[PDB]
Amino acid sequence: GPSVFLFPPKPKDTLMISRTPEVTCVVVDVSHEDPEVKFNWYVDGVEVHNAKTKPREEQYNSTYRVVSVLTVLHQDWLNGKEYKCKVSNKALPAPIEKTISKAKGQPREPQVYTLPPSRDELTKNVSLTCLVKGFYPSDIAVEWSSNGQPENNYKTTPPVLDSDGSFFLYSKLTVKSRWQQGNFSCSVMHEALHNHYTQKSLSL
Amino acid sequence: PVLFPPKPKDTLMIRTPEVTSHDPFNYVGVHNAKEEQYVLTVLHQDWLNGKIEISKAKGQPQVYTLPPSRDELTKNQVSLTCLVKGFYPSDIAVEWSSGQPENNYKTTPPVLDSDGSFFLYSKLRWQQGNVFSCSVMHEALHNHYTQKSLSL
Amino acid sequence: LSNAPLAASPGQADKVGAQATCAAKPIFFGYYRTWRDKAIELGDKWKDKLHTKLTDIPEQVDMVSLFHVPDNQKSDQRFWETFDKEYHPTLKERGTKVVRTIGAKLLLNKIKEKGLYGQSREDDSKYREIAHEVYEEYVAKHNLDGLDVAMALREVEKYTNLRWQLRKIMGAFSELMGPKAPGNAGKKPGDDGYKYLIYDTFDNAQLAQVALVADVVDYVLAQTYDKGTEESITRVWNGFRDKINSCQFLAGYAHPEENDTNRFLTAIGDVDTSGAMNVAAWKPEGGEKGGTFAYALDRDGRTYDGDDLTTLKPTDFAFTKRAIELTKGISL
């Protein structure tokens, strides 16, 4: 029958109180010419009624795809509360249930280290590296900036599990001109950092 | 009650590459093919040339070592970085040695760059002058192998 | 006759989780192998030596289920005559309820023979027909107290249409038995003339598919035949606590049978220290359970060592009496 997918909030939304974090429940394959979907939301098993639905997308091919979005409290998500979505529709013998929560485990502070380009890489038409290692819970944010202005031409690898149970990642900012003049900052956001934010500089 | 390609390290060494209720097989467009709960051997050049029911990625096929940052030299934890960028087919192998292989190393999955190419990072005696070497294996390299060293 | 649609609602009972109080006191439930009774007529190597009768079980047993297998004996007429004439009056005098167990595979086969698949809309009369036929044959024929659907098939959990069939047939049964039946109006489990609807299944709630029947059954019998530790029974109940309430939950154990190959070692050895009595004494944290059940009462105290694997012997019902004492907290 239909399928149910539960997606967590973006880490940046849960790390900044200025943003709005939301968990998303998606019901797909509501085919048969008899739709309607009922959503129920639960926090640690207690029913909550503060969710926002109403973005029905037809997406033709003989299915409907309904979504429900629940605003979550930053502290509730960071404390490891479980969010449960229950989908009820006449085409299912029993309502489908899904549950999502922050990865269990003791939070670990990320260590950020900036790396300059290898000399050999200077002859080809450079890459500034940002290693973020030793953090718990794969949710993290990494950005590049210079002189207070964000840099766009960068790419970050997905978190990779290290041999000690923590995660690590690398971010590469490709760039000469500003770097030639001795001018960069890699910003990292994680739940274990002081103020959920840290910056590491890198210059000639 | 089908589809997966062979392992990448097996296609680079002429190694062996192979590709794939309680109502309990039949494709090169020939007949040398062959677990309760609770393989077709392919030629290396055949797979490298692009040869219920489908080949290598179609397209035209830079190692840099980085020492640990100074701030990383506090308590015991140093990271020797190996950046491998600018290769096309995401199939690539990365290893570390120091003529003996080093096991405490981890490599991120390939990431598509803005120019369509891919890049990746490998994270790994050093104080005593011993030289480490990040070895990269790809289809576009000379002899299908390259090595970039790093030391003090 | 009725054409009302069998809903697919619920997913959980009207009350779930540990309930510190319910109307009915804990009960001891008993599975009885009918093909080991002295009144049943079984080339069998044990054509004689049938020592135990249905009345041999202790008088404190609250409910006993007839586990009848037609392919295990030649004829059952003598057994039914003895049940109507001797067994049932004695059990009625004792106040021990009698229910009949039916396999879920038989219900699925009856659904399939009627042409029913598993859909939302599907001719509102065939499910009631199968339910009423089973009710007449298995319960009303011998004036029993209810029906125990045994669902230990993992395919039901895997396939949507099988789940639909199970939900619809259990609703049709609930129109005849259980708390949803109109015949039980103003009645509660334990009262005279109450018709029970019982569901026995795996101790894993997902494979058990208890969310399909949680709102229509009186008890859920978790086959905890390999547990025997209070931690494991607590984990099982916690797996069940969000679909059913505690007063519906009964964890059980099985006594070693002859030529079984299954090997359940919770009810072997000394009674006072066996895991079966841990199960019998276990209770949901801050709550009351439905009781305790045991499989093969005629095998009470048997093991899988020596001649026990190839010989039938009478029983003193020691495990049964101890489990009764641990469930109801009284002294025999």
Swiss-Prot record, chain B:
Reported impact of residue 144 to R: Enhanced ability to activate the classical complement pathway
What changing residue 143 to A does, per the record, is:
Impaired ability to activate the classical complement pathway
Tell me which residues make up the Ig-like domain: 62-151
Q: What is the effect of changing residue 142 to A?
A: Impaired ability to activate the classical complement pathway
Instruction: Report the locations given in the UniProt record.
Output: Secreted; Cell membrane
Where in the chain are disulfide-linked cysteines found?
82-134
State the function annotated in the UniProt record: Immunoglobulins, also known as antibodies, are membrane-bound or secreted glycoproteins produced by B lymphocytes. In the recognition phase of humoral immunity, the membrane-bound immunoglobulins serve as receptors which, upon binding of a specific antigen, trigger the clonal expansion and differentiation of B lymphocytes into immunoglobulins-secreting plasma cells. Secreted immunoglobulins mediate the effector phase of humoral immunity, which results in the elimination of bound antigens.
Subunit and partners: Immunoglobulins are composed of two identical heavy chains and two identical light chains; disulfide-linked.
From the Swiss-Prot or TrEMBL record, give the protein name.
Answer: Immunoglobulin gamma-1 heavy chain
Write down the species.
Homo sapiens
The taxonomy runs:
Eukaryota, Metazoa, Chordata, Craniata, Vertebrata
